[PDB]
Amino acid sequence: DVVTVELVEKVTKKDLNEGMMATYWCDVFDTEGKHIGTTVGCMDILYLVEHVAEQIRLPDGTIMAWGTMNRSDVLAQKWITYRCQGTSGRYAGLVGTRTWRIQSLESYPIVAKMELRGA
Amino acid sequence: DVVTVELVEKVTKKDLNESGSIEGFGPGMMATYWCDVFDTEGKHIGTTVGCMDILYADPESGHLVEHVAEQIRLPDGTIMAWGTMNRSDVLAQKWITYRCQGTSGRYAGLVGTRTWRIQSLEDESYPIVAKMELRGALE
């Protein structure tokens, strides 16, 4: 049985070291625009190919996600797929995908779709 | 066949959640950080960036259990590391074991462990010794 979560996330903070690297924070909203959690993440630009590892906190548990994105695909508003794994609460033990894209081609909020199930 | 890397890492920047961010909880629930990475001869050779989330308090103790995901950039490649730790163990200067895998360069294709310990709590950069041991994922 799949667990499915649709989110909207907006960046509130980003630090960079200008192989650029970054850390960031996002507000997480449900589809009704209600504020329900937070994402923290880090990024390293491998070759432009970026590699992300992040953690998402939701009212009922926590998830880690990770993956590799081409910068230009993000900017074309293509769907990016990260792998993810529940780390606590309702998501514990579950694995799946976090598929997301820039919602609006400015502040660049994203829509993200998480699907997890037993491993 | 085993690749071993020994580092010292020291925090240079940290941010934690602010009041009002996380409903019902104060700063401390989540963090991002940066560290300077040094070799065993003490030369500055790279950077680590990371994030932390509190999972829960251990009902058997009251101790905080946290989860970390981080990335380390070295002159010859990059590694991703992640894991859960009990903060009691960390502050007691026990050795903490995280999983890690290479993401580029010399470490591409490699998997193993990142075992670390705080070298000093007095030093507000909380220097750690980290020992990474990696082997080929391909059997």
Author numbering:
A (entry chain B): 9 to 26, 36 to 64, 72 to 129, 132 to 145
B (entry chain A): 9 to 147
Reported in the publication:
Cyc15 shares 28 % sequence identity with AbyU and was identified in the draft genome of Streptomyces sp. NL15‐2 K as a hypothetical protein. The overall fold of Cyc15 is analogous to those reported for other spirotetronate cyclases, possessing an eight‐stranded antiparallel β‐barrel fold with (+1) 8 topology.
Chain A comprises residues 9–148 of the full‐length polypeptide, with Chain B comprising residues 9–145. The AlphaFold search model aligns well with our experimentally determined crystal structure with a Cα RMSD of 0.47 Å. The Cyc15 dimer interface is populated predominantly by hydrophobic residues, along with a pair of equivalently positioned cysteines (Cys59; one contributed by each monomer) which sit 5 Å apart. Each Cyc15 monomer houses a large, solvent exposed active site cavity, which is sealed at one end by a salt bridge formed between the residues Glu17 and Arg122. Access to this site is regulated via a flexible loop, formed by the β1‐β2 linker (residues Asn25‐Met36), which caps the opposing end of the barrel. In our Cyc15 crystal structure electron density is only observed for the capping loop of Chain A, which is packed tightly against a symmetry partner. As a consequence of this arrangement, the side chain of Glu132 from each copy of Chain A extends into the entrance of the central cavity of a symmetry partner, forcing the recipients capping loop into an ‘open’ conformation. Docking studies indicate a mode of substrate binding consistent with the formation of the diastereomer 3, providing a structural explanation for the observed stereochemical output of the Cyc15 catalysed reaction.
